[PDB]
Design a protein around this nucleic acid. Sequence first.
RNA 1: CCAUAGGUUAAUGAGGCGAACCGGGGGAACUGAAACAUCUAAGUACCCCGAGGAAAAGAAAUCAACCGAGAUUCCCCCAG
RNA 2: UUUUGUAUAAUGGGUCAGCGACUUAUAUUCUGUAGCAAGGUUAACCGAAUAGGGGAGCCGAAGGGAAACCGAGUCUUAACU
RNA 3: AGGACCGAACCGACUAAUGUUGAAAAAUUAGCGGAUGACUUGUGGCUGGGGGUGAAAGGCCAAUCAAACCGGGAGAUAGCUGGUUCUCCCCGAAAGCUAUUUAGGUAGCGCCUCGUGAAUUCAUCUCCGGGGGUAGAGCACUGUUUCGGCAAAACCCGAUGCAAACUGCGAAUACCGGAGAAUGUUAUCACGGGAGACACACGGCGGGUGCUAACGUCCGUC
RNA 4: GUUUAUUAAAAACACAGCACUGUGCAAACACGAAAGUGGACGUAUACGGUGUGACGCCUGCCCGGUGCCGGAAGGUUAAUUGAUGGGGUUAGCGCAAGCGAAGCUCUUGAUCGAAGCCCCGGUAAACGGCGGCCUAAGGUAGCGA
RNA 5: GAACUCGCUGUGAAGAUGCAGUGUACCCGCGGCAAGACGGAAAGACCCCGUGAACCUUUACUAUAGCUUGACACUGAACAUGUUCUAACGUUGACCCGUAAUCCGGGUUGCGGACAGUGUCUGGUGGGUAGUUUGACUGGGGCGGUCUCCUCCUAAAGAGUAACGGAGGAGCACGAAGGUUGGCUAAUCCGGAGGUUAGUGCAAUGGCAUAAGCCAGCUUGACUGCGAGCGUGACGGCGCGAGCAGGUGCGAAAGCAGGUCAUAGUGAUCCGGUGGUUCUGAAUGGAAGGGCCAUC
RNA 6: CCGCGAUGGUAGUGUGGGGUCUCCCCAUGCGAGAGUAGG
Lengths: 75, 50, 64
Amino acid sequence: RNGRDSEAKRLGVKRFGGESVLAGSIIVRQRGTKFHAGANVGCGRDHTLFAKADGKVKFEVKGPKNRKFISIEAE
Amino acid sequence: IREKIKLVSSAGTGHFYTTTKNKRTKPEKLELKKFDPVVRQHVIYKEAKI
Amino acid sequence: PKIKTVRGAAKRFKKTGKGGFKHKHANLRHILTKKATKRKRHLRPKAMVSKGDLGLVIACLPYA
RNA sequence: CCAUAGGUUAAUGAGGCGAACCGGGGGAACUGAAACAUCUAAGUACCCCGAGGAAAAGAAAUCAACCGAGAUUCCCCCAG
RNA sequence: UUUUGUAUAAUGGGUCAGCGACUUAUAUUCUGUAGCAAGGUUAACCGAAUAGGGGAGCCGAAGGGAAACCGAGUCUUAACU
RNA sequence: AGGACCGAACCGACUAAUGUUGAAAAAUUAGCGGAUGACUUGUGGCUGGGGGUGAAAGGCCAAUCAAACCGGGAGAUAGCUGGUUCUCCCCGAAAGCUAUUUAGGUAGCGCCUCGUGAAUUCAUCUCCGGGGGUAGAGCACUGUUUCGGCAAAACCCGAUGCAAACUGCGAAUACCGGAGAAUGUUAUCACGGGAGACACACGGCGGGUGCUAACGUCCGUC
RNA sequence: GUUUAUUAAAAACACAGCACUGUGCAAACACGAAAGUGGACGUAUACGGUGUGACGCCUGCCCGGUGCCGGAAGGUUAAUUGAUGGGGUUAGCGCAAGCGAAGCUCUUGAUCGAAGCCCCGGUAAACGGCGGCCUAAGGUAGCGA
RNA sequence: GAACUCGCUGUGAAGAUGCAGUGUACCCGCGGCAAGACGGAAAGACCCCGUGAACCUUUACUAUAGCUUGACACUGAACAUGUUCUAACGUUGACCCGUAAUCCGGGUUGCGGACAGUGUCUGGUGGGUAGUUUGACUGGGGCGGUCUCCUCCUAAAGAGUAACGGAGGAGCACGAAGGUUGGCUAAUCCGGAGGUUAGUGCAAUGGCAUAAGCCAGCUUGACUGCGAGCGUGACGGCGCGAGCAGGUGCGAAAGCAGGUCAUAGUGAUCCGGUGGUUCUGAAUGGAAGGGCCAUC
RNA sequence: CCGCGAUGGUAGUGUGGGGUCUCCCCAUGCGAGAGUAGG
Ligand SMILES: [K+]
Ligand SMILES: [K+]
Ligand SMILES: [K+]
Ligand SMILES: [K+]
Ligand SMILES: [K+]
Ligand SMILES: [K+]
Ligand SMILES: [K+]
Ligand SMILES: [K+]
Ligand SMILES: [K+]
Ligand SMILES: [K+]
Ligand SMILES: [K+]
Ligand SMILES: [K+]
Ligand SMILES: [K+]
Ligand SMILES: [K+]
Ligand SMILES: [K+]
Ligand SMILES: [K+]
Ligand SMILES: [K+]
Ligand SMILES: [K+]
Ligand SMILES: [K+]
Ligand SMILES: [K+]
Ligand SMILES: [K+]
Ligand SMILES: [K+]
Ligand SMILES: [Mg+2]
Ligand SMILES: [Mg+2]
Ligand SMILES: [Mg+2]
Ligand SMILES: [Mg+2]
Ligand SMILES: [Mg+2]
Ligand SMILES: [Mg+2]
Ligand SMILES: [Mg+2]
Ligand SMILES: [Mg+2]
Ligand SMILES: [Mg+2]
Ligand SMILES: [Mg+2]
Ligand SMILES: [Mg+2]
Ligand SMILES: [Mg+2]
Ligand SMILES: [Mg+2]
Ligand SMILES: [Mg+2]
Ligand SMILES: [Mg+2]
Ligand SMILES: [Mg+2]
Ligand SMILES: [Mg+2]
Ligand SMILES: [Mg+2]
Ligand SMILES: [Mg+2]
Ligand SMILES: [Mg+2]
Ligand SMILES: [Mg+2]
Ligand SMILES: [Mg+2]
Ligand SMILES: [Mg+2]
Ligand SMILES: [Mg+2]
Ligand SMILES: [Mg+2]
Ligand SMILES: [Mg+2]
Ligand SMILES: [Mg+2]
Ligand SMILES: [Mg+2]
Ligand SMILES: [Mg+2]
Ligand SMILES: [Mg+2]
Ligand SMILES: [Mg+2]
Ligand SMILES: [Mg+2]
Ligand SMILES: [Mg+2]
Ligand SMILES: [Mg+2]
Ligand SMILES: [Mg+2]
Ligand SMILES: [Mg+2]
Ligand SMILES: [Mg+2]
Ligand SMILES: [Mg+2]
Ligand SMILES: [Mg+2]
Ligand SMILES: [Mg+2]
Ligand SMILES: [Mg+2]
Ligand SMILES: [Mg+2]
Ligand SMILES: [Mg+2]
Ligand SMILES: [Mg+2]
Ligand SMILES: [Mg+2]
Ligand SMILES: [Mg+2]
Ligand SMILES: [Mg+2]
Ligand SMILES: [Mg+2]
Ligand SMILES: [Mg+2]
Ligand SMILES: [Mg+2]
Ligand SMILES: [Mg+2]
Ligand SMILES: [Mg+2]
Ligand SMILES: [Mg+2]
Ligand SMILES: [Mg+2]
Ligand SMILES: [Mg+2]
Ligand SMILES: [Mg+2]
Ligand SMILES: [Mg+2]
Ligand SMILES: [Mg+2]
Ligand SMILES: [Mg+2]
Ligand SMILES: [Mg+2]
Ligand SMILES: [Mg+2]
Ligand SMILES: [Mg+2]
Ligand SMILES: [Mg+2]
Ligand SMILES: [Mg+2]
Ligand SMILES: [Mg+2]
Ligand SMILES: [Mg+2]
Ligand SMILES: [Mg+2]
């Protein structure tokens, strides 16, 4: 009665902290907002976080909930 | 059970969109203002057969 | 004797200036209502044959 | 009934053989398609008839494109 | 020889001598090499001619577009940042 | 009289032994059945291959029969098996992924080789920037569990454990990026010519399966 | 009696007998592109096909399925025929947009239309079937580890 | 294959004359026996595999001989919308002649007669005959199960990762359940406590209060052309995306909107259909057909 | 900006080596979680 599975979705972090990225570059693929969009980062319809400017990726923990945000520090 | 329909431009261009409809629940004709790229204006589009 | 062109390949590929091949994208013949306009728009322009496939296309089109 | 069929004789010709080529009457399948039926192999193999030193074809109810060509046959291109 | 692996009790060979398996034609691409070079090269054929003639053609010097068409651009689009 | 009876010739072929590189590619020996009949035999004739003939066994059709023999199509096809012949020098795999009427075949990619081009391109270490949810741990959560207390035995509280599909915690390593030196025959990447390979095996470590059975089986990694 | 020439001789095949069924003679049927020939120089007490297998006592129920036989009202239905509509072309008409006769032409397919099938019956010595509320009908006689 | 061809216990492609260790054994015949040389013989017949074969079966597929239907032809004449007629045609009735002939032909005559029969076309029937198909995975094959897509775990804290491993889902729904602006906050227990323990259109996981949960008003951005850059794939492909142009909705405006909390809800190419179209149009003008765009 | 916590020990673990090898130990490096003092 078992024997089924789905294709692996290649989620996860594509660009880690301090990496130089071009605008448009995908930083994380995820299901929901496990990471949140900080400065110069957009959030796509499938919760993909992507760079809206050229610069370096920065992960940070901010807010009252203590949420993982991703920003781009512009070069 | 949802059936494919055309939405046909009222501008007389022959431009159409396609969508689906549940004709059992919603037998009345779908009418929407949509962009007609031929005349390059938003005009009324009205349901027709696919 | 002369090599014969694979005539089905000649109807689907055209050789470009630097010797690549252009083709029409798959998935824009039918079952179009369910496809997003964005997806269909991106399938309209012709594309280049990929590196992996060039060997197969060249074999089929010796007089390209 | 006239006749015609039929009968006898005479003259002239034919008959059979032969390797290929040639025109015609018929005409496979294996095989390929990675199976298979459309399709392919192929109008091939093979069978049959007929001919000649060659045969067949041949003097436009042909092409062309508004300019023109000028029977048929064969070769090189056009072009995989 | 075949195999993950064979002294293998897996295969093949009694021995010797002789013969016995990547060829040939045409097309196409790449490499080497030679000629000529924005050109290169001729086919059939003619020629007693490996000569010489024959440039019909073929490839190249421009591309883009399904195409008309435009052309160092062109296509896309009403039009391109 | 008789598809009557016993029994030679004649026609058969039930049993046994022998023989089995035989005396014989079906016999010999001892026994056995029919023996006036739907009998047996000589000579000649007729039926021809998807055809004949068959008191029917797919039997027989010249020691050949679920489609004769001979010649031809013909070198059918063979993703299968076998075999593949002189010498030296340099490099040197794979037995994986994806797809496949695919699974012992094949294709693209990965890995080999040759050529060409190109960056401090690549590797090791050190330092720096990163995301982790594994090991371990824990029990707030999702389940499971025992004891006591409390009390509508629920709930709640204290105490004790357990978890691949539990996480209010959380390593080592590994991986991505940056910087720096030393070292390394560019070890790197791209493009092009030529491949082979896509049956793997055992051992260590982490696991699923099996019985923490298998020289078992299926992954990861060396 | 017959049989697997060469591992099977038998309970297998055949058989007289039985039944069903076809066949009116240029028979059915078979061999044959055909002409013809066999059937048969026979003629239904004959000939072919099928099953059963001397003889004795017998051979029950089911026609729903499949076949065969009969029916022929109705439905459906071929070639054929080409009504009707729609289009192409262009003599014209239009200042232009367009419209557009005749002819030719592309398409559409009214009407006509047999057997078959559906349909209505029959038929089991046709192929077959023969119960634990259900079926076409529920296995009779005889026999039975 | 070559042999100078012992036993044993181990080892080992896992049952050893040939390896290890060890024991035994002077060299060579002859008659005997068959335990071993996985002895000889035959490229296992069983079993599986090959997109091998043959022949056989049938309500497998596609054909087809035969049988059968009708139309037209050979094929005609009188009214009926009935039959009759003779002249085509048939005769495997009789007689005559060619003729020494149960063939054949001709003649005469009778019978039948536009029927029968044959050709072309056509519906039916058609294992009588023919060509073929009849999947793969698989702890042998078969039987059963499975085959594409989504979620979790296995999965070793980046990605990926197998088994006929462990568990569940999908093949949609929705003109609002989409867009925007404003407003609102649950389960459960007894107004209060509690704080998401609820909710999500549907599995599971990760998300969601700024709520993505929930209500109302106004709406059609479930827009058209494009797209820096990036993710993921052998490839075909699939995904995310600021921003630009045009035109739009909501809001006061900033802004937001290129469908839906996200991840399933799917099908290449061919062939053809429909609409559109500054394309093509085999002498020329058209047309047909083709192309392109949208779509089935 | 976003409401705890040493020290020590213990668990685990990279590399190398070892055993009585379903599990451990040694050398070296890294070193939790829980809890304790305390804040
Ligand atoms: K990226
Ligand atoms: K064939
Ligand atoms: K094949
Ligand atoms: K083997
Ligand atoms: K063997
Ligand atoms: K060459
Ligand atoms: K050259
Ligand atoms: K450009
Ligand atoms: K034969
Ligand atoms: K491959
Ligand atoms: K290479
Ligand atoms: K391993
Ligand atoms: K006997
Ligand atoms: K019946
Ligand atoms: K007309
Ligand atoms: K020894
Ligand atoms: K022996
Ligand atoms: K007569
Ligand atoms: K008639
Ligand atoms: K298995
Ligand atoms: K097994
Ligand atoms: K806009
Ligand atoms: Mg998987
Ligand atoms: Mg998953
Ligand atoms: Mg289309
Ligand atoms: Mg084939
Ligand atoms: Mg002569
Ligand atoms: Mg002549
Ligand atoms: Mg003229
Ligand atoms: Mg083996
Ligand atoms: Mg060895
Ligand atoms: Mg030996
Ligand atoms: Mg050997
Ligand atoms: Mg072998
Ligand atoms: Mg041998
Ligand atoms: Mg050009
Ligand atoms: Mg007697
Ligand atoms: Mg006999
Ligand atoms: Mg005897
Ligand atoms: Mg007797
Ligand atoms: Mg006797
Ligand atoms: Mg038999
Ligand atoms: Mg014989
Ligand atoms: Mg045969
Ligand atoms: Mg051949
Ligand atoms: Mg051969
Ligand atoms: Mg080396
Ligand atoms: Mg796939
Ligand atoms: Mg644990
Ligand atoms: Mg866990
Ligand atoms: Mg680094
Ligand atoms: Mg394979
Ligand atoms: Mg493999
Ligand atoms: Mg394997
Ligand atoms: Mg492996
Ligand atoms: Mg292990
Ligand atoms: Mg193993
Ligand atoms: Mg093991
Ligand atoms: Mg007897
Ligand atoms: Mg015998
Ligand atoms: Mg016998
Ligand atoms: Mg007769
Ligand atoms: Mg009987
Ligand atoms: Mg009728
Ligand atoms: Mg009755
Ligand atoms: Mg009784
Ligand atoms: Mg031993
Ligand atoms: Mg001896
Ligand atoms: Mg003996
Ligand atoms: Mg042997
Ligand atoms: Mg064999
Ligand atoms: Mg008739
Ligand atoms: Mg049949
Ligand atoms: Mg058959
Ligand atoms: Mg064939
Ligand atoms: Mg077959
Ligand atoms: Mg299989
Ligand atoms: Mg992972
Ligand atoms: Mg990991
Ligand atoms: Mg792997
Ligand atoms: Mg694998
Ligand atoms: Mg799996
Ligand atoms: Mg780009
Ligand atoms: Mg077709
Ligand atoms: Mg024209
Ligand atoms: Mg014309
Ligand atoms: Mg068109
Ligand atoms: Mg400490
Ligand atoms: Mg601590």
